[PDB]
């Protein structure tokens, strides 16, 4: 494969034990690092807040400093991959944890992902569709061993009553093959983002901007 | 439906980005709060150590104190039924999540579970089969709304080389109409458990003796 | 050198930036379990929860199954002793941790406790003074080696709305000699305990059960 | 009252169970971000690595985006002030807690830290003195309400093994006066630093580096 250019996602589970179920394509430019995606609901209304499933809605299209590739895209282009474990524990006692999958089609991508989430307060921000904007974020990777990142950050969003909602969020990354040497001298790697997300009941439409970064200016 | 009596389980999912597949039966004693299962490997030698699927591996076997029936009992025994989600966050930075689902057909329970686990040192306890035992555990369960239980233990396996290994879990359970209110006030419940695992690398044998108890003697 | 029949307390500390002092003396029953405390504020009424306060208001009072020593008992007897060193990570963000040192003079201990509490929501139950009781608990206990007890046990206190307010607590134990081979090779340990607290402002009055146990 | 040129410290507690106590005096730019501290111990030779005092070995001298001040340094040029409470949570069982005091004499700032650390095996890289170095680090900052930062971030040391050593840092920090609304608005706040720090067994050479950035 190149970089990606397009990308379309299959991604299902449940919350609070009440199944999910959308789908939709977007795309994106692998050289900025910016991504759009649109979903749409299989299986009639959501009864959670959308902004839930952010960050889990393709760190291929995330290059690293000076256009080098991301181990991602890097195992996109020679086609060996990898897969993602995410988790995100919640302040008030939820856990979501997904599983990432992906096939390659030339320049384009096929997600499959498979959530579970659980323990949402009735009252809380999810349940109640409260949760506002997500805060934007510093991820921060190392490779413990040559095939694998642990990443993590503290993830936030505001809210409708003012109070952010917050997580503890922690994404395994496995590799099928060994990651270029010289990526793995440069540790710790940290990724600034931001989303932005707009929704209904029915259907999302997401966008993200990524940049890496090992320093600031 | 009665009190189980008799389980089967299809257990599956990834290690370390490596899939694997059991199935197996078994039987217990919903009054002591004993089970037993065999397992059996469909997709070859397990990579990793078996006693990682250990607490995967039915609460509807385990009675509430005096011979009450415990919440998992009683939603078994009108056939409303729940499901679990479960988070176990290793010290090394490994992660395993699982969901587990049910099927009764009279005396008799189909488990399937879907586990994701990641983030294994290639050196560490898991990845070399160095676990030797689980310690003994204390389950502590609370009930903060009518239809979920969130409970907690601190789980340490016994290793090769003397030192401990251990891991936060955290287990949400959904159920499918509201718990009984007699049960509900009841809080916090701790179950005491036990466990034993004879295994190869194809096949295991697990056992497991629990009761619940709100004080003790 | 005794087991303990009466103890005192002078803890001090911060919570949310405001300092605090109490003193006072109890009692209780080494070979029971059971031990008593009152406090009273050095420094005006507080302006937290006392109920905050709990765990931190002394183990030399448990003993251990078949009325063995536990080792905080042990460490007292001969005199070697321990510090405790506790950490409460709250699930609003607020953070508590402690550190606990005594004098032993015959059958009484002194305490002398430094807490540092911060990041309680200004509408949270602890500074709104809205937690009713603390809810019976089981303390998981491991010897990671000879001289340190590494324990956790999840604390939760009813509050007036009915919603639970629950923390994560690990207490890390360092004894100034080892801890005797006959307990170390009984892991984990469970120690079970009920306490109560009666408050205004300015005192307080606990009570506390605690029994060992290594199976039910 | 002008922003801070120089500073001392006087830093003690316990790890592990030892007492240890250090000070000494360094200085830096708040213009700038950069300060640079030397500590001598007043307790004979420091039993564990002293890369575990980093990030406790000042915030007032970081500036924030365009020339404003910091929280931190408003605090210190109204003379309201402020406290900081940290903990650090290893992967290894450990813990290491502090309580962060100020005295500010025109530009010059006093501090008073208070630790207490334990849990560290044995055969752990603290107690071998096997740090060699702190990566780089991205401090999230957020207000949850006028006086208090709730800060994160996830700290590692290299060590001589290859295996790197991490804990989660959680950082609470209690204003005397309201933080300027202007600053409020601005969340989260990110700040990147870096250290350096050359040791013996008696003494400490520490320097850092810090930016402020909401962005990239």
Same mark, same amino acid.
């Given at each position: 494969?190149?970089? &990606?250019?397009?990308?379309?996602?299959?991604?299902?589970?449940?919350?609070?034990?009440?199944?999910?179920?959308?789908?939709?394509?977007?795309?994106?430019?692998?050289?900025?690092?910016?991504?759009?995606?649109?979903?749409?609901?299989?299986?009639?209304?959501?009864?959670?807040?959308?902004?839930?499933?952010?960050?889990?809605?393709?760190?291929?299209?995330?290059?690293?400093?000076?256009?080098?590739?991301?181990?991602?895209?890097?195992?996109?282009?020679?086609?060996?991959?990898?897969?993602?474990?995410?988790?995100?524990?919640?302040?008030?006692?939820?856990?979501?944890?997904?599983?990432?999958?992906?096939?390659?089609?030339?320049?384009?991508?096929?997600?499959?992902?498979?959530?579970?989430?659980?323990?949402?307060?009735?009252?809380?921000?999810?349940?109640?569709?409260?949760?506002?904007?997500?805060?934007?974020?510093?991820?921060?990777?190392?490779? &413990?061993?040559?095939?694998?990142?642990?990443?993590?950050?503290?993830?936030?969003?505001?809210?409708?009553?003012?109070?952010?909602?917050?997580?503890?969020?922690?994404?395994?990354?496995?590799?099928?093959? &060994?990651?270029?040497?010289?990526?793995?001298?440069?540790? &710790?790697?940290?990724?600034?983002?931001?989303?932005?997300?707009?929704?209904?009941?029915?259907?999302?439409?997401?966008?993200?901007?990524?940049?890496?970064?090992?320093?600031?200016?």
């Amino acid at each position: 494969s190149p970089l &990606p250019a397009t990308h379309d996602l299959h991604i299902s589970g449940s919350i609070n034990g009440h199944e999910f179920d959308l789908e939709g394509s977007g795309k994106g430019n692998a050289k900025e690092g910016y991504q759009e995606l649109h979903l749409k609901s299989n299986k009639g209304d959501l009864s959670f807040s959308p902004w839930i499933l952010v960050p889990n809605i393709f760190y291929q299209y995330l290059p690293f400093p000076d256009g080098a590739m991301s181990p991602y895209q890097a195992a996109m282009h020679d086609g060996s991959g990898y897969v993602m474990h995410r988790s995100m524990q919640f302040e008030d006692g939820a856990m979501l944890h997904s599983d990432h999958r992906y096939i390659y089609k030339g320049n384009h991508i096929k997600g499959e992902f498979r959530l579970t989430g659980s323990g949402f307060p009735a009252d809380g921000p999810v349940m109640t569709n409260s949760l506002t904007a997500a805060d934007w974020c510093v991820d921060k990777l190392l490779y &413990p061993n040559d095939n694998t990142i642990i990443g993590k950050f503290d993830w936030t969003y505001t809210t409708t009553s003012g109070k952010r909602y917050q997580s503890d969020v922690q994404t395994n990354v496995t590799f099928g093959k &060994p990651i270029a040497a010289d990526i793995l001298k440069k540790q &710790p790697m940290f990724v600034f983002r931001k989303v932005e997300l707009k929704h209904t009941k029915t259907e999302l439409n997401f966008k993200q901007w990524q940049k890496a970064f090992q320093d600031i200016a």
